[PDB]
From a paper:
Fibrillarin (FBL) is an essential and evolutionarily highly conserved S-adenosyl methionine (SAM) dependent methyltransferase. It is the catalytic component of a multiprotein complex that facilitates 2′-O-methylation of ribosomal RNAs (rRNAs), a modification essential for accurate and efficient protein synthesis in eukaryotic cells. Fibrillarin consists of an N-terminal glycine–arginine-rich domain (GAR), which is believed to be important for organisation of the nucleolus, and a C-terminal domain with a Rossmann fold that is characteristic of class I S-adenosylmethionine (SAM)-dependent methyltransferases. In the present study, we determined, to our knowledge, the first crystal structures of hFBL in ligand-free state, bound to the native cofactor SAM, and in complex with two fragments that can compete with SAM for binding to the cofactor site.
We selected 4 derivatives of 1, namely 1a, 1b, 1c, and 1d. They all have an amide linker that connects a synthetically convenient analogue of 1 and an amino acid, the latter of which showed potential to stabilise the loop W137-K143 via ionic interactions between their terminal carboxylate group and the amino moiety on the side chain of K143. A different orientation of the fused bicyclic ring was observed for 1a from 1 with concomitant movements of some binding site residues, especially D236. In addition, electron density for 1a was not observed beyond the amide linker, which appeared to be turning away from the catalytic site and pointing towards the bulk solvent. This indicates that the extended D-phenylalanine moiety did not bind as well as the methionine portion of SAM, and was consequently exposed to the bulk solvent, which in turn affects the orientation of the fused bicyclic ring. Indeed, the binding affinity of 1a turned out to be similar to that of 1.
Numbering used by the authors: 86 to 99, 105 to 317
């Protein structure tokens, strides 16, 4: 066998690859590996950990990623769809990925990606004001975000309070240099974990992303709002 399933469901390994929901198409120039044995054919896409914090996290040995076939996902800061494309591969045609991006430039890449992928919903909106787009968002199982400013963990939490089910999960990368360049990476990470806790987003694991990123963490946890 030439592509083995990874511990994480929907993730495969040769290095890290996902099953291409759109056979024949690359999203960001990634290699595509197709394996045929008779009439059976399956195409995978290379998942670059120097571009995608999530792939770096999986390679780094993260225990859970909480996306699987059928999962409903809210991705804040979807940019041009790099990481979202692979989340879309994993959740498959019965899952759903809401891809929120403020940038209109990035948004056009996202809409283009979503033309081919029925499970992506581009939402070209400011995640600071979820009320503007709340009527489009069915309640999700998992939220993803890259936090790069000192206000963004709260912005993620306001979206969790609006859209994330009780007992759903979050996967949040943290770019310490962008949050506070005058603080140590460790102090930024502790401060962001504390901001999470104060919003009932309870971390369950965390890791840094060396060698792919410097002073970049990924935190995985569970949302436990009060009644
Ligand atoms: N040009 C930009 O504004 C990039 C960007 C950052 N960004 N951060 C979040 C947050 F993490 F807060 F959820 C959501 C977004 C997003 O839509 N776009």
């Amino acid at each position: 066998v030439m592509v083995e399933p990874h511990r994480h469901e929907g993730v495969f390994i040769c290095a890290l690859v996902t099953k291409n929901l759109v056979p024949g198409e690359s999203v960001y120039g990634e290699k595509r590996v197709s394996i045929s044995e008779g009439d059976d054919k399956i195409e995978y896409r290379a998942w670059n950990p120097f571009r995608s914090k999530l792939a770096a996290a999986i390679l780094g040995g993260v225990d859970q990623i909480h996306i699987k076939p059928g999962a409903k996902v809210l991705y804040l800061g979807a940019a041009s769809g790099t990481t979202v494309s692979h989340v879309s591969d994993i959740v498959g045609p019965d899952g759903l990925v809401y891809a929120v991006e403020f940038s209109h430039r990035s948004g056009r890449d996202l809409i283009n990606l979503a033309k081919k992928r029925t499970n992506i919903i581009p939402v070209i909106e400011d995640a600071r004001h979820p009320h503007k787009y709340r009527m489009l968002i069915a309640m999700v199982d998992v939220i993803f975000a890259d936090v790069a400013q000192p206000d963004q963990t709260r912005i993620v939490a306001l979206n969790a309070h609006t859209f994330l089910r009780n007992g759903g999960h979050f996967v949040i990368s943290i770019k310490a240099n962008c949050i506070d360049s005058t603080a140590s990476a460790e102090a930024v990470f502790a401060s962001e974990v504390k901001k999470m806790q104060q919003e009932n987003m309870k971390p369950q694991e965390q890791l840094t992303l060396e060698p792919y990123e410097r002073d970049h963490a990924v935190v995985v946890g569970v949302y436990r709002p009060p009644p």
